[PDB]
Tab-separated table of C-alpha atoms in Angstrom:
chain	number	residue	atom	x	y	z
A	1	UNK	CA	93.639	127.029	143.594
A	2	UNK	CA	95.436	127.517	140.282
A	3	UNK	CA	96.481	130.411	137.539
A	4	UNK	CA	92.671	129.085	136.006
A	5	UNK	CA	90.509	129.828	139.221
A	6	UNK	CA	93.203	133.243	139.416
A	7	UNK	CA	91.940	135.169	136.210
A	8	UNK	CA	88.255	133.779	136.968
A	9	UNK	CA	88.294	135.341	139.962
A	10	UNK	CA	90.233	138.676	138.936
A	11	UNK	CA	87.142	139.265	137.012
A	12	UNK	CA	84.404	138.498	139.263
A	13	UNK	CA	85.607	140.948	141.966
A	14	UNK	CA	85.664	143.919	139.811
A	15	UNK	CA	83.849	143.316	136.511
A	16	UNK	CA	80.353	141.644	138.089
A	17	UNK	CA	77.055	142.647	139.472
A	18	UNK	CA	73.950	141.130	140.242
A	19	UNK	CA	71.137	141.855	137.966
A	20	UNK	CA	67.723	140.666	138.689
A	21	UNK	CA	65.115	141.030	136.471
A	22	UNK	CA	60.908	139.688	136.096
A	23	UNK	CA	62.436	136.713	135.304
A	24	UNK	CA	64.823	136.036	137.710
A	25	UNK	CA	68.429	136.375	139.267
A	26	UNK	CA	71.594	136.622	136.834
A	27	UNK	CA	75.730	136.886	137.432
A	28	UNK	CA	76.337	139.692	134.368
A	29	UNK	CA	79.300	140.715	133.152
A	30	UNK	CA	80.766	144.698	132.875
A	31	UNK	CA	82.490	145.150	129.768
A	32	UNK	CA	83.483	148.761	130.072
A	33	UNK	CA	81.997	152.305	131.107
A	34	UNK	CA	78.256	151.382	132.362
A	35	UNK	CA	77.993	148.521	129.185
A	36	UNK	CA	77.593	145.201	130.608
A	37	UNK	CA	75.908	141.550	128.691
A	38	UNK	CA	73.717	139.008	130.300
A	39	UNK	CA	70.996	136.541	128.661
A	40	UNK	CA	68.812	137.149	126.261
A	41	UNK	CA	66.162	135.274	128.371
A	42	UNK	CA	66.518	137.562	131.118
A	43	UNK	CA	64.128	140.192	129.432
A	44	UNK	CA	65.478	142.910	130.386
A	45	UNK	CA	63.232	146.115	130.559
A	46	UNK	CA	63.817	149.718	130.626
A	47	UNK	CA	64.449	149.232	134.977
A	48	UNK	CA	66.571	146.266	136.327
A	49	UNK	CA	67.581	145.430	139.777
A	50	UNK	CA	71.384	146.140	140.448
A	51	UNK	CA	73.206	144.672	143.512
A	52	UNK	CA	69.189	145.049	145.302
A	53	UNK	CA	69.497	148.749	143.841
A	54	UNK	CA	66.712	149.960	141.288
A	55	UNK	CA	69.020	151.335	138.198
A	56	UNK	CA	67.136	152.396	134.596
A	57	UNK	CA	68.367	150.940	131.314
A	58	UNK	CA	69.278	153.641	129.060
A	59	UNK	CA	70.153	151.261	125.848
A	60	UNK	CA	69.513	147.223	125.385
A	61	UNK	CA	70.218	145.805	122.379
A	62	UNK	CA	69.464	141.833	121.701
A	63	UNK	CA	72.538	140.708	119.188
A	64	UNK	CA	71.367	138.272	115.896
A	65	UNK	CA	74.000	137.614	113.332
A	66	UNK	CA	74.061	138.630	109.998
A	67	UNK	CA	71.848	135.428	109.241
A	68	UNK	CA	69.442	137.277	111.886
A	69	UNK	CA	69.808	134.081	114.375
A	70	UNK	CA	69.187	134.556	117.787
A	71	UNK	CA	72.838	135.049	119.360
A	72	UNK	CA	71.667	135.052	123.146
A	73	UNK	CA	73.837	138.341	123.497
A	74	UNK	CA	71.333	141.220	125.120
A	75	UNK	CA	73.677	143.896	125.398
A	76	UNK	CA	72.971	146.757	128.556
A	77	UNK	CA	73.338	150.451	129.033
A	78	UNK	CA	73.237	150.814	132.952
A	79	UNK	CA	72.445	154.987	134.742
A	80	UNK	CA	74.600	153.970	137.265
A	81	UNK	CA	77.250	156.270	138.705
A	82	UNK	CA	80.127	154.378	138.258
A	83	UNK	CA	81.908	152.640	135.680
A	84	UNK	CA	83.550	149.076	134.961
A	85	UNK	CA	86.790	148.563	134.482
A	86	UNK	CA	87.786	147.979	130.872
A	87	UNK	CA	88.064	144.072	129.840
A	88	UNK	CA	87.755	144.563	126.507
A	89	UNK	CA	91.361	144.100	125.346
A	90	UNK	CA	90.979	140.598	127.304
A	91	UNK	CA	87.690	139.507	124.534
A	92	UNK	CA	88.944	137.045	121.758
A	93	UNK	CA	88.272	138.486	118.474
A	94	UNK	CA	87.701	135.306	116.831
A	95	UNK	CA	84.975	131.861	116.957
A	96	UNK	CA	87.382	129.487	118.615
A	97	UNK	CA	87.987	126.543	120.579
A	98	UNK	CA	90.131	126.531	124.236
A	99	UNK	CA	91.267	123.814	126.419
A	100	UNK	CA	91.335	124.710	130.053
A	101	UNK	CA	88.014	127.207	131.491
A	102	UNK	CA	86.585	128.655	134.119
A	103	UNK	CA	82.356	129.230	134.862
A	104	UNK	CA	82.568	131.334	137.305
A	105	UNK	CA	78.588	133.230	138.556
A	106	UNK	CA	78.143	135.325	141.681
A	107	UNK	CA	74.442	135.400	142.881
A	108	UNK	CA	72.513	135.304	145.926
A	109	UNK	CA	71.753	131.887	145.700
A	110	UNK	CA	75.224	130.666	144.404
A	111	UNK	CA	78.248	133.093	145.678
A	112	UNK	CA	81.814	132.749	144.899
A	113	UNK	CA	81.035	129.663	142.661
A	114	UNK	CA	84.112	128.680	140.743
A	115	UNK	CA	83.447	125.466	138.267
A	116	UNK	CA	86.073	123.884	136.021
A	117	UNK	CA	84.650	122.760	132.911
A	118	UNK	CA	87.881	121.707	130.968
A	119	UNK	CA	87.356	121.713	126.826
A	120	UNK	CA	85.167	123.921	125.231
A	121	UNK	CA	84.219	123.251	121.548
A	122	UNK	CA	83.323	125.590	118.748
A	123	UNK	CA	79.713	124.130	118.804
A	124	UNK	CA	78.395	126.711	116.584
A	125	UNK	CA	73.941	126.237	116.191
A	126	UNK	CA	72.629	125.102	118.534
A	127	UNK	CA	68.499	124.884	118.938
A	128	UNK	CA	67.919	126.281	122.637
A	129	UNK	CA	64.805	125.924	124.488
A	130	UNK	CA	63.290	126.260	121.159
A	131	UNK	CA	65.395	129.265	119.456
A	132	UNK	CA	68.073	128.663	116.489
A	133	UNK	CA	70.923	130.536	118.045
A	134	UNK	CA	74.375	130.234	116.678
A	135	UNK	CA	78.174	131.644	117.602
A	136	UNK	CA	77.737	128.095	120.837
A	137	UNK	CA	79.997	126.849	122.758
A	138	UNK	CA	79.951	123.654	124.867
A	139	UNK	CA	81.647	122.134	127.426
A	140	UNK	CA	80.841	119.085	129.206
A	141	UNK	CA	80.192	119.869	132.704
A	142	UNK	CA	75.781	119.568	134.490
A	143	UNK	CA	75.758	123.407	134.588
A	144	UNK	CA	72.097	123.796	136.628
A	145	UNK	CA	69.702	126.514	137.029
A	146	UNK	CA	71.015	130.079	138.306
A	147	UNK	CA	74.231	129.806	136.530
A	148	UNK	CA	73.086	131.440	133.420
A	149	UNK	CA	74.789	134.387	133.176
A	150	UNK	CA	78.249	132.697	134.780
A	151	UNK	CA	81.940	134.636	133.136
A	152	UNK	CA	83.511	131.592	131.128
A	153	UNK	CA	87.359	132.318	131.277
A	154	UNK	CA	90.256	131.136	130.330
A	155	UNK	CA	93.423	132.018	131.371
A	156	UNK	CA	93.747	135.725	129.917
A	157	UNK	CA	90.705	135.452	128.025
A	158	UNK	CA	87.339	136.350	128.936
A	159	UNK	CA	85.408	133.857	126.005
A	160	UNK	CA	81.189	133.567	126.584
A	161	UNK	CA	78.586	133.786	129.149
A	162	UNK	CA	76.473	130.661	129.941
A	163	UNK	CA	72.793	130.642	128.346
A	164	UNK	CA	72.070	127.094	129.011
A	165	UNK	CA	72.267	123.215	129.800
A	166	UNK	CA	71.179	119.417	128.864
A	167	UNK	CA	71.105	118.211	132.465
A	168	UNK	CA	74.920	116.739	131.027
A	169	UNK	CA	76.390	119.738	128.030
A	170	UNK	CA	76.882	123.353	129.364
A	171	UNK	CA	76.593	125.939	126.727
A	172	UNK	CA	77.521	129.593	126.298
A	173	UNK	CA	77.223	132.513	124.401
A	174	UNK	CA	80.725	133.842	122.209
A	175	UNK	CA	82.217	137.249	123.714
A	176	UNK	CA	83.453	138.889	120.322
A	177	UNK	CA	85.377	142.332	120.698
A	178	UNK	CA	83.473	143.230	117.645
A	179	UNK	CA	80.715	143.406	119.963
A	180	UNK	CA	81.963	146.621	122.311
A	181	UNK	CA	83.475	148.783	119.465
A	182	UNK	CA	82.204	152.406	120.766
């Protein structure tokens, strides 16, 4: 409907796949080459389904900060025959607050879904399903089951992936440029 939704759509149309693990269907953001991200609670194994095709996982790393605290991001390298558009230049370099964000989801259940979530706070610490978690972004939208892995964008920046909610607020794990230096 406007430039926020335009940037979000551009990312969804080229840089997402539908990932399925034993823990469900997730929006999955491809970042560059065969490297993608998914919430750590997806429990990625040796094999994953990508757009309903059996795909070997070449590597999977559950990120933690240097205090050895969960970040809820898993970086996956996929045995896929095709590279993602490189979107690393849209990643923030530092932790920050944002205005006017969009959460975008694409699953079998929720295709072509875009939510204007508004102002995003650098919330920091969250007890997420019992797990101490750092680098959390918060937005005042009542997000629901099926949105995990959803991409959080502003115009010109890809800032996080949706990892949970409390019924009133939604929470995303930060994406930082430093996670994807090769």
